[PDB]
Write a protein that binds this ligand. Structure first.
Ligand SMILES: O=C(O)CNC(=O)c1nc(Cl)c2ccccc2c1O
Ligand SMILES: [Mn+2]
Length: 217
């Protein structure tokens, strides 16, 4: 679907109502597979970090590490398609101009590609932007084909503010996710028992970012 139709008919309404929006079959199988290949290539070639230190035992050889990451600009060799995804995300947000809350998005971060090794590690409950650093929207694209949470875990659980219940999102292949980056969406990644890949970009609100530079300097 054209970025515009998706943004106007689904993304905008959903975000303003729930603060969370899931779009399946974003780029299609062919493009999705290419991004998956590039990401897997980055991993296999050692472009990722060793992973977040979860437990620091006395013996550093027993230390358990979690999610591995790598920042991607989208212009690097072998990351062309990742750049395409980023460009597609940008087009989508551009068409949401002035319709997502009262925000005015004028920029984004590079892409943060994350890999949960599948060794039982996840990500503790947290808020992406709890101190007003400018990030208003978190966008995540998943690349895990035939992912079955009942067997591999890795579910993204969001705890919507003021709502007793929570929203569980499986990291399904070619799935695109949007949610407010602030305290409205505390979330966690449940333990993953299979290699789990995701690509995240954060979009900045013009005003929040402008004044963030004042304090955080
Ligand atoms: O991957 C997911 O479904 C959800 N991931 C996250 O919420 C998440 N958040 C942050 Cl702030 C980081 C930060 C660093 C590395 C991985 C992260 C991560 O996967
Ligand atoms: Mn997060």
């Amino acid at each position: 679907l054209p970025a515009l139709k998706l943004a106007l008919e689904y993304i905008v309404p959903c975000m303003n109502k729930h603060g969370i929006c899931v779009v399946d079959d974003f780029l299609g199988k062919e493009t999705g597979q290419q991004i998956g290949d590039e990401v897997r290539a980055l991993h296999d070639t050692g472009k990722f970090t060793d992973g977040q230190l979860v437990s620091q035992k006395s013996d550093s050889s027993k230390d358990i590490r979690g999610d591995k990451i790598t920042w991607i600009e989208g212009k690097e060799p072998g990351c062309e398609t990742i750049g395409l995804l980023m460009s597609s995300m940008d087009d989508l947000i551009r068409h949401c101009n002035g319709k997502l809350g009262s925000y005015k998005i004028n920029g984004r971060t590079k892409a943060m590609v994350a890999c949960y090794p599948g060794n039982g590690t996840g990500y503790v409950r947290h808020v992406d932007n709890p101190n007003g650093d400018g990030r208003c929207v978190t966008c995540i694209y998943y690349l895990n084909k035939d992912w079955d949470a009942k067997v591999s875990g890795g579910i993204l659980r969001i705890f919507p503010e003021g709502k007793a219940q929570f929203a569980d999102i499986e990291p399904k292949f070619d799935r695109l996710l949007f949610f407010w980056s602030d305290r409205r969406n505390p979330h966690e990644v449940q333990p993953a028992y299979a290699t789990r890949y995701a690509i995240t970009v954060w979009y900045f609100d013009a005003d929040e970012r402008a004044r963030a530079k004042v304090k955080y300097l």
